[PDB]
Amino acid sequence: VRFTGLSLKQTQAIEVLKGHISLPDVEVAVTQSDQASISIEGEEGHYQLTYRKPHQLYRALSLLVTVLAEADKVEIEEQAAYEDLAYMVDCSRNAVLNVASAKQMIEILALMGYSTFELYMEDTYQIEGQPYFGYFRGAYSAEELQEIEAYAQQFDVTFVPCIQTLAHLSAFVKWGVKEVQELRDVEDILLIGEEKVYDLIDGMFATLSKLKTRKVNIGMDEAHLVGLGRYLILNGVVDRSLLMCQHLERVLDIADKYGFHCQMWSDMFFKLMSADGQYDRDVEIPEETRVYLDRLKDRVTLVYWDYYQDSEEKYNRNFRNHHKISHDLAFAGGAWKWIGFTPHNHFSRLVAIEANKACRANQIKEVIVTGWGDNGGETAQFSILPSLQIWAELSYRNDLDGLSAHFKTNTGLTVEDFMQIDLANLLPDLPGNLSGINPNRYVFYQDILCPILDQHMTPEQDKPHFAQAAETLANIKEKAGNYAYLFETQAQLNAILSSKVDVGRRIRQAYQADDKESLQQIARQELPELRSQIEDFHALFSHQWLKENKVFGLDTVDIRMGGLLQRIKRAESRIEVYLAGQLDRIDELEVEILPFTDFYADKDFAATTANQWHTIATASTIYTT
Amino acid sequence: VRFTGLSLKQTQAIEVLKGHISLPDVEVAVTQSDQASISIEGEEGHYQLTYRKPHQLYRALSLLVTVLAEADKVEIEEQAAYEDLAYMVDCSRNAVLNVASAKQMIEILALMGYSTFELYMEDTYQIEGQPYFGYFRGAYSAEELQEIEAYAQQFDVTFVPCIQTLAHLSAFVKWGVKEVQELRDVEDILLIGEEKVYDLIDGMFATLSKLKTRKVNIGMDEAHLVGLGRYLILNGVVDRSLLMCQHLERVLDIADKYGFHCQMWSDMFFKPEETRVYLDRLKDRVTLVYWDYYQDSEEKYNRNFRNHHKISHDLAFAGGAWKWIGFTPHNHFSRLVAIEANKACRANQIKEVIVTGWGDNGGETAQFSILPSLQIWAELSYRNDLDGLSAHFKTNTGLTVEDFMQIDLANLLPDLPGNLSGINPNRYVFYQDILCPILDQHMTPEQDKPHFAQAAETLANIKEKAGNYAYLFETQAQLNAILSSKVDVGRRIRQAYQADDKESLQQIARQELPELRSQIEDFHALFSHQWLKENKVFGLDTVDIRMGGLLQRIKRAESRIEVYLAGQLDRIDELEVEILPFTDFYAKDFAATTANQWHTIATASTIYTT
Ligand SMILES: CC(=O)N[C@@H]1[C@@H](O)[C@H](O)[C@@H](CO)O[C@H]1O
Ligand SMILES: CC(=O)N[C@@H]1[C@@H](O)[C@H](O)[C@@H](CO)O[C@H]1O
């Protein structure tokens, strides 16, 4: 290609992006213009390209490459619905995105049209004088954060840290030293009102002030027991909505000291002022609280987060409730990658289409796409590219007509191929519109002898589904280039699930039937092979993890998978003891299996949602004293 | 041995106890008498033996066997200080004592002089119509509880169930079904005021009423978050002491319905005029239990007794047989505190002592690990001294009390003050990671390595003397063998790495760590044999998970070193993190500490949280 109008910064950015896309040999005149987010016009190898904001050059080039593969004449104009579109990576659930992968992610977000890159870090950034904060977690140094931000700046992409200034600090407050314990209210919540807490928070902002950015998400979601622990012991019973405002004021004051403009998750206002303590609800605002909120609302952007609703009207109602507090709002949607090993791009697509309608209908200026990693970060960081492309398409075009072509330009894969990554969750009898159904994870981590999720399995449909999935994913792996690792991991997982889905039930059927030959084959053949397959899965998982993330946090997966392997060994040994006539009965197998949960009991499929490792793996105590 | 004066019941009991003690070739005349708890006299192969309470026959027999080893003429008289002496086994922390082992424990308690046997069961007894209560936990059936109680009765020992009627029901309330969730306030706490909660509690007493006993410990400590969860959302703010009162009244009413008389922990009374009056009313219906496992001085117990007596004189004392700090008990520390507690209980007219055998965080210590602590409490009750401790112990077990107490060794680091509780290197040295050894500051390899090595040899020798108890010492010998190398393996990896001594890193990765894994798998085998001997199979799974996890982490240490050695890694990031103190709890002229949650020993990462 021959470009005119480019700055050195822009030519360098394009050099980097040539690692993702091939620019045709054509002539392109590039200028900034307020006329459109993106405009591309021309024919016969001579083109005029304009962008409104500098970062939008990179989506413009993605569109260019795409459109020119087919046609000679180009007529493209896009007007983005959102002033800012962000992707937030969870770096607090054990998986800290490594610097090299943050760079890759930035390049991709640039090509997609995102303005903003965000990292969610509860304790995973280093604070001078707080040596337990992020200790052995791979917390980013100030230097690493600076390097990441400066790399985003190469593409005119803004960096926004998402931190926690109230709750969700469990990995820090666990440390049994005076300087940490003195900071606690209860659970994962800091002690409102305590000077040492505000010293800590001043440290947080001191660290972030080393960056160029002066935009921050300060957290404050999900502090359900706020004011009810050591706070209650010291202060007695207080108005908790005012308590929230008091803490918020002090944090905004600290932010001000460093020149930051803040956003926060909105849920605690709703939980503390609704009838049943829930988010998705209307609120009675006490007068003294209203007055306090009327001040504070001018100093912070409230972020309404919702990853779940299947209809615009459901989001709309919540936006309406938020308007009672503030018209300075943003929306956080979901790239579903927090339900085990396997994402749910399909469900993310369904909710994105409807959330986009509601955001537009409520003149929402910013959408943050969230990539949470609940309970260990076991899903791949790059597993949700389709979901990111979907939101970009919805902002820029208000439809998904360009989704597959732009996605193929950006990744080398069709969007439908890449979205097969979801397969371990896609049981055939599920409706598309229910969230969190995650057999990928609970079929994997379930015990053998004591399979407490067995009532949720449907082997006649699930076995062939997982088996077919493994073949499909093996095929996509072969044409996935640099993303092949993602698919190889999923293929092996599905291969394991195909047999593991009912091995526990088949053991019980054979035991009840006195089919000792079957018992023997399971214990001597099937289970040692299952261990072999799990060890291979562990290797592939580790390869994936170390490619994307820092090493810290992988230890939890080692522990979990080692435990699973040992429990398979126990199934083998207990069966052998019984077969050698050294047991009259195998007591584990005499316990009748109950439903694990009734969450989806009223629905016409067996699968469910089960997303805590420690309750998947055992009915015994493991966490409690 | 020829006896006169025995019933059929007593004859059969003695026949069982021959499994434990060797009755010499003498004639013994047995009668009940109020003159003493135990009296024995006679000479030249003719003896007169008296007991006050029927169960005390069995301690008397142990005393008799003992003295006659030494002498012909006997003049024994004991007056026990406590009306009741109980041992309470924890069956809620994953380890549910199996029926055969409960029988063994009863036999030993009878020989020692215990009047009462207790099982602590949060969710580990079955309630008809509550299928999730004890599900996959090895919950005792009604019939199993009856059989255990009946066995105790064979020796005139009474049974007391220890249950929970408000909080500490974590293993039950986790179940995500309507019939369970509607019973919940928050965390491990049931929902006060909910009629379905009182339906459950009625169910609890319906099960226990199948027993002969009408004495129960109902739990009822003061959990901080009572009233603060789904209670707060449903009902607004209430005085939470007043809430405790309302719930306690309902529980007591249910217990009355079934004829039970209740004990409970004294916590909620420790300390609004509405509340004072309510508390005062309820205190008349219960015996309070003051529990203390920690104090090193009678003076400190006495202070707490005085304070309790401002609340109620209807008071019992719970002491501690330290078996809740990992794999290895602390009989030594239990002896220290028993001596002082006994002084204080006597000074304050305490009528009942309950020795507690908690199994905190997985039940990994052997059920029979604390026999010395139990004999200690018996001697203190009956004789007010330990001058006959070892001789009586050896009659009962085959082992001197000093030999048996070597079971503690994995905790007994040389530079520890004997009077500080919960220092448990047995556990955190074992479960600590290799690459990220977050307890390394608490290790003193130059002292700890030979201590653990010498312990393993000592324990191998005691195993040979231990008969039916050998399994306990075999387990502990192997643990100490492991800890001798593991205590500093992470540190030696860091040293070799920092010195760029690749030969040493290779030796550690290729020889030492695979051998460590082999040793841990050996320990796992021995531990499993020990567990299955003493306990139901349920709960063993948690140990399998924890140990399989540790093995996999040792594998990671091997593989990370291999990749580095091969040039495919510029650095091993885990090894570049400076290790801080794990806790400042005992920050001191020793480095050891207390760390008793597996999940925080094993990783600085999240593992339970969302
Ligand atoms: C602000 C927010 O969304 N908070 C939590 C988040 O930590 C969790 O990871 C996510 C996905 O389950 O949803 C919420 O429960
Ligand atoms: C009444 C009582 O003793 N309650 C707990 C008990 O559940 C625990 O196992 C034990 C040993 O640490 O100490 C107490 O805190």
Q: What is the DSSP string of A382-397?
A: TTTHHHHHHHHHHHHH
Beta pairing, strands B38-43 & B74-78: antiparallel
Question: How far is it, in rounded angstroms, from Cα B346 to Cα B81?
Answer: 7
For A141-194, where are the alpha helices, taking DSSP H only? 142-153, 170-173, 178-181
Interface mutation target, options A273, A558, A585, chain B, most CBs of B under 10 Å: A558
Chain B hits for A175, Cβ within 8 Å: 583
The CA distances from residue B462 to A446, B406, B450, B472, B524, in Å, are 41, 8, 18, 10, 20
Per-residue exposure over A38-48, b if at least 16 CB sit within 10 Å of its own CB, e if not: bbbebeeeebb
Residue A515: is it exposed, middle or buried by C-beta count within 10 angstroms (0-12/13-18/19+)? middle
Beta pairing, strands A2-4 & A27-32: parallel
Question: How far is it, in rounded angstroms, from Cα B127 to Cα B131?
Answer: 7
Beta pairing, strands A84-90 & A116-120: parallel
Q: Which amino acid is at A331?
A: F
Are B542 and A625 a contacting pair at CB < 8 A?
Answer: no
Q: What are phi and psi of B174, to 5 degrees?
A: -70, -20
Question: How far is it, in rounded angstroms, from Cα A451 to Cα A617?
Answer: 9
Q: Which amino acid is at B551?
A: L
How far is A135 from chain B, CA to nearest CA, in Å? 7
For B401-539, where are the alpha helices, taking DSSP H only? 401-405, 425-431, 445-463, 470-498, 502-507, 513-534
The CA distances from residue A20 to A53, A65, A544, in Å, are 22, 11, 20
Coil/strand/helix, residue A175: coil
* One-character DSSP codes across B293-337: S----HHHHHHHHHHHHTT-S-EEEEEE----SSSS--HHHHHHH
What are chain A's domains? Answer: 1-79 (3.30.160.230), 80-400 (3.20.20.80), 401-625 (1.20.120.670)
The three-point CA angle A438-A440-A443 to 5° equals 100
Taking alpha carbons only, the member of B370, B367, B454, B379 closest to residue B407 is B370
**Minimum CA distance residue for ligand 1 atom 3:** A305
Question: How far is it, in rounded angstroms, from Cα B346 to Cα B178?
Answer: 50
Spatial contact of B567 and B489, defined as CB atoms under 8 Å apart:
no
A99-112 vs A142-153: helix crossing angle, rounded to 10: 30
Taking alpha carbons only, the member of B302, B228, B308, B231 closest to residue B267 is B308
Taking alpha carbons only, the member of A182, A198, A202, A193 closest to residue A227 is A193
Are A562 and B553 a contacting pair at CB < 8 A?
Answer: yes
Q: Is the dihedral of CA A319, A324, A325, A329 positive or negative?
A: positive
Nearest to B574 among A551, A570, A598 (CB): A551
Residue A161 CA to ligand 1 centre (angstroms): 16
Are A567 and B536 a contacting pair at CB < 8 A?
Answer: no
Mapped to the 3 state alphabet, what secondary structure does B540-608 carry? HHHHHHHHHHHHHHHHHHHHHHHHHHCCCCCCCHHHHCCCCCCECCCCCCCCCCCCCCHHHHHCCCCCC
Are B552 and A569 a contacting pair at CB < 8 A?
Answer: no
Question: How far is it, in rounded angstroms, from Cα A621 to Cα A498?
Answer: 29
* β-strand partners of B315: B288
User: What count of other Cβ atoms lies within 10 Å of the Cβ of residue B570?
Assistant: 7
Residue A398: is it exposed, middle or buried by C-beta count within 10 angstroms (0-12/13-18/19+)? middle
Question: How far is it, in rounded angstroms, from Cα A169 to Cα B221?
Answer: 28
Question: How far is it, in rounded angstroms, from Cα A610 to Cα A596?
Answer: 8
Ligand 1 nearest-atom number relative to CA A93: 9
Spatial contact of B50 and B31, defined as CB atoms under 8 Å apart:
yes
The CA distances from residue B517 to A33, A569, B520, in Å, are 66, 15, 5
**DSSP annotation of B143:** H
Question: How far is it, in rounded angstroms, from Cα B121 to Cα B162?
Answer: 6
Report the residue of chain B nearest A564, measured CA to CA.
B545
Question: How far is it, in rounded angstroms, from Cα A162 to Cα A87?
Answer: 11
Question: How far is it, in rounded angstroms, from Cα A198 to Cα A203?
Answer: 8
Phi-psi region of A514 (alpha: psi -120 to 50; beta: other; left: phi over 0): left
Q: Is the dihedral of CA A445, A448, A453, A455 positive or negative?
A: positive
A459-478 vs A484-513: helix crossing angle, rounded to 10: 160
Report the residue of chain B nearest A611, measured CA to CA.
B610
Question: How far is it, in rounded angstroms, from Cα A279 to Cα A319?
Answer: 12
The three-point CA angle A584-A585-A589 to 5° equals 175
Are A570 and B225 a contacting pair at CB < 8 A?
Answer: no
Interface mutation target, options B137, B544, B560, B571, chain A, most CBs of A under 10 Å: B544
Q: What are phi and psi of B439, to 5 degrees?
A: -105, 10
Question: How far is it, in rounded angstroms, from Cα B326 to Cα B595?
Answer: 9
Question: How far is it, in rounded angstroms, from Cα A430 to Cα B356?
Answer: 51
Question: How far is it, in rounded angstroms, from Cα B473 to Cα B404?
Answer: 9
Q: Which amino acid is at A235?
A: N
**DSSP annotation of A305:** E
Instruction: Look at chain A and count its residues.
Output: 625
Nearest to A555 among B361, B551, B605 (CB): B605
The greatest distance separating any two alpha carbons of chain B, rounded to the nearest whole angstrom, comes to 84
Question: How far is it, in rounded angstroms, from Cα B593 to Cα A101?
Answer: 40
Q: What residues have CB less than 8 Å from A517, skipping those under 6 apart?
A: none
Residue A87 CA to ligand 1 centre (angstroms): 15
Are B135 and A587 a contacting pair at CB < 8 A?
Answer: no
Ligand nearest to the CA of A368: 1
Spatial contact of A215 and A263, defined as CB atoms under 8 Å apart:
yes
Output the six-digit token pair for B329: 């008990």
Taking alpha carbons only, the member of A155, A158, A149, A159 closest to residue A61 is A155
Question: How far is it, in rounded angstroms, from Cα B396 to Cα B564?
Answer: 57
Residue A351: its H or E element: helix A345-361
Spatial contact of B233 and B177, defined as CB atoms under 8 Å apart:
no
The CA distances from residue A292 to A115, A246, A394, in Å, are 33, 9, 36
Taking alpha carbons only, the member of B541, B513, B507, B515 closest to residue B527 is B541
Residue A372 CA to ligand 1 centre (angstroms): 7
How far is A482 from chain B, CA to nearest CA, in Å? 19
Output the six-digit token pair for A566: 């040992």
Size of interface A-B (CB pairs under 8 A): 199
Spatial contact of B299 and B347, defined as CB atoms under 8 Å apart:
no
Interface mutation target, options A240, A452, A547, A559, chain B, most CBs of B under 10 Å: A559
Coil/strand/helix, residue A441: helix
* β-strand partners of B125: B140
The radius of gyration computed from the CA coordinates of chain B, to the nearest angstrom, equals 26
How far is B175 from chain A, CA to nearest CA, in Å? 7
Spatial contact of A480 and A457, defined as CB atoms under 8 Å apart:
no
The three-point CA angle A185-A188-A192 to 5° equals 35
Q: CB of A445 closer than 6 A to ligand 1?
A: no
The three-point CA angle A403-A404-A409 to 5° equals 100
Q: What residues have CB less than 8 Å from B3, skipping those under 6 apart?
A: B11, B14, B27, B28, B29, B30
SS3 content of chain A, % helix, strand, coil (to 5): 50, 15, 40
Taking alpha carbons only, the member of A467, A465, A471 closest to residue A487 is A471
Q: CB of A221 closer than 6 A to ligand 1?
A: yes
Resolution of the PDB structure in angstroms: 1.8
Spatial contact of B437 and B491, defined as CB atoms under 8 Å apart:
yes
What residues does ligand 2 touch, defined as CB less than 6 Å away? B 221, 265, 291, 324, 358, 360
How far is A484 from chain B, CA to nearest CA, in Å? 21
Nearest to A563 among B94, B186, B544 (CB): B544
Q: Which amino acid is at B264?
A: M
**Minimum CA distance residue for ligand 2 atom 13:** B358
Beta pairing, strands B158-162 & B184-186: unpaired
Spatial contact of B117 and B153, defined as CB atoms under 8 Å apart:
no
Output the six-digit token pair for B8: 């059929």
Spatial contact of B361 and B94, defined as CB atoms under 8 Å apart:
no
How far is B418 from chain A, CA to nearest CA, in Å? 23
Question: How far is it, in rounded angstroms, from Cα A450 to Cα B538?
Answer: 9
CA dihedral B517, B523, B529, B534 (to 10 degrees): -130
